[PDB]
Amino acid sequence: SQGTFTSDYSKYLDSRRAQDFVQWLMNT
Numbered sequence: 001s002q003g004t005f006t007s008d009y010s011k012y013l014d015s016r017r018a019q020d021f022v023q024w025l026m027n028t
C-alpha cells in the first residue's frame, strides 16, 4: 500500500492543484 510519504506527497500535489484553481478563479 501507499505509505505515509507517498500519501502526504499526494496531498501536497492536491494543494498545488487547488491553489492553481484558486488563482484561476481570480484570473480574467
Ligand SMILES: [Cl-]
Pocket (backbone or CB within 6 Å): 002, 003, 004, 005, 006, 007
Ligand atoms: Cl511511501
Ligand SMILES: [Cl-]
Pocket (backbone or CB within 6 Å): 016, 017, 020
Ligand atoms: Cl497542477
